[PDB]
Amino acid sequence: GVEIETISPGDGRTFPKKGQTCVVHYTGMLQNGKKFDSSRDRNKPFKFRIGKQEVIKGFEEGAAQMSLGQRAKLTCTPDVAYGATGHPGVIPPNATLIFDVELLNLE
Numbered sequence: 001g002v003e004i005e006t007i008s009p010g011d012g013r014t015f016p017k018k019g020q021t022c023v024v025h026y027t028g029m030l031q032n033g034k035k036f037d038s039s040r041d042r043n044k045p046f047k048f049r050i051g052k053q054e055v056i057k058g059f060e061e062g063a064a065q066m067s068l069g070q071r072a073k074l075t076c077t078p079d080v081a082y083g084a085t086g087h088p089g090v091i092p093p094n095a096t097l098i099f100d101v102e103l104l105n106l107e
Contacts, residue, residue, distance in 0.1 A: 001077045002061040010069030010103075021049040022063065022105035029098035031075075036090060045104070056081035059099065066103045074099035 016022050023045050028037030039046045048054055050063060058076030066072050076097035077083070086093035 002058050002065070002080075003075050004062060004065050005073035005075075006066065007071040007073070010067050010071070012067050012070070014068035014105075016050050016064050016066070016103070016105070018051045019049070020105075020107040021047060022103060022107065023047050024063070025102045025104060026059075027100040029100065031096045031098050058097065059101070062099075062101060063103070066101065068103055068105060071100070071102045074101055 024039065025045050026037070026039050027035065029035055050060070053060075055063070056076065057080035058074060059081075061080075062072060062074045074097070076099065078094045078096055081097060082091045083094045083096075086095060091097075
Protein backbone atom coordinates (compact mmCIF):
# COMPACT_ATOMS: atom_id res chain seq x y z
CA GLY A 1 0.00 0.00 0.00
CA VAL A 2 2.62 2.53 -1.09
CA GLU A 3 1.03 5.85 -2.08
CA ILE A 4 3.26 8.26 -4.00
CA GLU A 5 2.91 12.03 -3.50
CA THR A 6 5.27 13.53 -6.07
CA ILE A 7 6.19 17.18 -6.02
CA SER A 8 6.15 17.80 -9.76
CA PRO A 9 9.55 18.89 -11.20
CA GLY A 10 11.91 16.38 -12.77
CA ASP A 11 11.55 14.68 -16.14
CA GLY A 12 8.89 12.02 -15.59
CA ARG A 13 10.61 9.52 -17.87
CA THR A 14 13.89 8.23 -16.34
CA PHE A 15 12.37 5.38 -14.43
CA PRO A 16 14.66 3.12 -12.37
CA LYS A 17 15.07 -0.47 -13.56
CA LYS A 18 16.94 -3.60 -12.54
CA GLY A 19 20.71 -3.48 -12.43
CA GLN A 20 20.63 0.30 -11.97
CA THR A 21 22.45 1.89 -9.03
CA CYS A 22 20.71 5.07 -7.92
CA VAL A 23 21.33 8.03 -5.63
CA VAL A 24 18.68 9.42 -3.26
CA HIS A 25 18.56 12.39 -0.87
CA TYR A 26 16.17 10.66 1.49
CA THR A 27 14.96 11.78 4.92
CA GLY A 28 13.39 9.63 7.62
CA MET A 29 10.29 10.89 9.43
CA LEU A 30 8.06 9.20 11.99
CA GLN A 31 4.33 9.75 11.75
CA ASN A 32 3.25 11.19 15.13
CA GLY A 33 6.97 11.45 15.77
CA LYS A 34 10.20 13.16 14.87
CA LYS A 35 13.01 12.44 12.42
CA PHE A 36 15.16 9.35 12.73
CA ASP A 37 17.36 9.32 9.61
CA SER A 38 18.73 11.77 7.04
CA SER A 39 21.18 11.46 4.17
CA ARG A 40 21.50 15.26 4.27
CA ASP A 41 23.35 15.15 7.61
CA ARG A 42 26.28 13.01 6.49
CA ASN A 43 26.00 14.48 2.95
CA LYS A 44 26.88 11.14 1.34
CA PRO A 45 23.73 10.66 -0.72
CA PHE A 46 23.24 6.90 -0.29
CA LYS A 47 24.28 5.09 -3.45
CA PHE A 48 22.25 1.89 -3.80
CA ARG A 49 20.90 -0.41 -6.50
CA ILE A 50 17.43 -1.79 -7.19
CA GLY A 51 16.28 -5.39 -6.83
CA LYS A 52 18.78 -6.92 -4.39
CA GLN A 53 16.36 -6.43 -1.43
CA GLU A 54 18.76 -4.03 0.29
CA VAL A 55 16.15 -1.42 1.26
CA ILE A 56 12.73 -2.07 2.82
CA LYS A 57 9.73 -3.04 0.70
CA GLY A 58 7.95 0.31 0.96
CA PHE A 59 11.01 2.27 -0.16
CA GLU A 60 11.70 -0.27 -2.92
CA GLU A 61 8.23 0.10 -4.43
CA GLY A 62 8.37 3.88 -4.12
CA ALA A 63 11.76 4.09 -5.83
CA ALA A 64 10.58 2.42 -9.05
CA GLN A 65 7.51 4.69 -9.22
CA MET A 66 9.61 7.89 -9.39
CA SER A 67 11.86 9.45 -12.03
CA LEU A 68 14.98 11.61 -12.22
CA GLY A 69 14.71 14.92 -10.40
CA GLN A 70 11.30 14.11 -8.93
CA ARG A 71 10.53 14.62 -5.25
CA ALA A 72 7.97 12.22 -3.81
CA LYS A 73 6.67 11.68 -0.27
CA LEU A 74 6.43 8.13 1.05
CA THR A 75 3.95 6.75 3.57
CA CYS A 76 5.31 3.32 4.47
CA THR A 77 2.82 0.80 5.82
CA PRO A 78 3.94 -1.17 8.90
CA ASP A 79 3.65 -4.63 7.31
CA VAL A 80 6.24 -3.93 4.59
CA ALA A 81 9.16 -2.63 6.69
CA TYR A 82 9.14 -3.32 10.45
CA GLY A 83 5.59 -3.27 11.88
CA ALA A 84 5.76 -6.87 13.03
CA THR A 85 9.22 -6.53 14.60
CA GLY A 86 10.33 -2.91 14.83
CA HIS A 87 14.00 -1.98 14.74
CA PRO A 88 15.16 -2.15 18.39
CA GLY A 89 15.48 1.24 20.05
CA VAL A 90 14.86 3.11 16.79
CA ILE A 91 11.58 1.78 15.38
CA PRO A 92 8.74 0.64 17.67
CA PRO A 93 6.49 -2.24 16.57
CA ASN A 94 3.57 -1.27 14.30
CA ALA A 95 4.98 2.04 13.09
CA THR A 96 3.93 4.00 10.00
CA LEU A 97 6.85 5.75 8.34
CA ILE A 98 7.19 8.99 6.37
CA PHE A 99 9.95 9.73 3.85
CA ASP A 100 10.83 12.70 1.67
CA VAL A 101 12.53 11.05 -1.30
CA GLU A 102 14.29 12.79 -4.19
CA LEU A 103 15.87 10.83 -7.04
CA LEU A 104 19.04 12.55 -8.30
CA ASN A 105 20.81 9.49 -9.65
CA LEU A 106 22.83 7.84 -12.38
CA GLU A 107 21.96 4.73 -14.45
